[PDB]
Amino acid sequence: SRYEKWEKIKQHYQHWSDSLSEEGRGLLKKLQIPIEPKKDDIIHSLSQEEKELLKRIQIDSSDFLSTEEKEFLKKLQIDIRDLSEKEKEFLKKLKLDIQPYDINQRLQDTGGLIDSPSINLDVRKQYKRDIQNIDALLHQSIGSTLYNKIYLYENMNINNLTATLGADLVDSTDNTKINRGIFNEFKKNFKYSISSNYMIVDINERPALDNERLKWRIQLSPDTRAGYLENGKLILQRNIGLEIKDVQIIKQSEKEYIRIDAKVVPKSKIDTKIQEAQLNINQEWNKALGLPKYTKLITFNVHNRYASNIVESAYLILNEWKNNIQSDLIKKVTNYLVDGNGRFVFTDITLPNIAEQYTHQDEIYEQVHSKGLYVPESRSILLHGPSKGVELRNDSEGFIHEFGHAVDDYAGYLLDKNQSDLVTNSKKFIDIFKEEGSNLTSYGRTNEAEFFAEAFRLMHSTDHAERLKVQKNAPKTFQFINDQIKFIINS
């Protein structure tokens, strides 16, 4: 029964609990409840000019802020009151000062690569101290008597794993039901999972919050280390692997959920699978694209809870890429990327924590997290699995947008090989952007490079209506891009 189970586990950990120092207990509380930035500090730091600037900014308009970041900045605005390049620059620096201190989020965002230079040095070092301390606290395993007598439970927002499927998971017609087509897409390549942070799990299953439609049931290993937390919870050691055993729809009080049955396994077992897959997909695509033996183009940087889908979807994404773009274009541009040690990075950690970005972007205010990125300095395409591109149907479309940036790069390279610029920085394209730049997607308005990439993506849609739309509504752009493709292919 529930309370017998709770009693047994609490008692198992009673000596551990009683042995905790005040610092140890304080750290565990710090872990459960992140420390929010103080609005007072921020506002006092601002000058009259910036206060004047912040007062007028339409925060909703920002494309590069999270909902939570927007709320906080909205509250800042509210406390002060009582689209342009200059405004974007100010927000990019200010976004730095508004991050909560959140150990589990730092671990998830970095996949445990906590030296990544994506947060200020002082806080970066404090995270490291705290994580080392918590690691040392968690020395006691669940054991051989309890591991197969108890399940542990975790409710989860599907957007943590895939916001792309999360958009459609709940039946649009009926709150209470799960879309079974979307369910099947979720389940298809979900075979293993990694926890890079400290899982906080319930001893007895609890009702999910409204935005949580995933209900994990987890079997621990006898060797899994953990600590008891008040109110019938365990905190699990970080860096564990999970094998997915079963994924099914369940119904609790007339409301449908996805049950995920998982079993804890050594993380090394899963990491080995990811590394083997990485070699296999490179071997396949080296042969397909006629790349030299031993070329390392594709990288799996995979550390989080939808791990196997990052891997499996990379195959599908590259297939869609090859199926929708001219072969000569794909071969010439990819060879150019490889010549500069470029990578296709598929990842479930945030993009500022990817070396192909941060090695070339020292300033945090210049680092970007997004669905995807092209980094000319490393000739790399980065694609973030869990997020959803706002105007995209699927992840393949995001990859093709980034490949459009690589096309822009190579086309510009061919024009002047010794000083290599983007073709979107040419006079011809700048004039075209200023004329037609509002005629396609909302995001395509951002600047020349994004307009090119968005037009390129739409021109290679599986929806022929979308290619037509570009030709009709942005004819100069359509022609320009086809001219660049011909230019590259005839080189």
Ligand SMILES: CNC(=O)[C@H](Cc1c[nH]c2ccccc12)NC(=O)[C@@H](CC(=O)NO)CC(C)C
């Ligand atoms: C996750 N939501 C999104 O779709 C963000 C939102 C966004 C708009 N402007 C920004 C500036 C900085 C960071 C994020 C954003 N946009 C992107 O991911 C696009 C970034 C891009 O152009 N990469 O080449 C790629 C997409 C078209 C596939």
Ligand SMILES: [Zn+2]
């Ligand atoms: Zn882009």
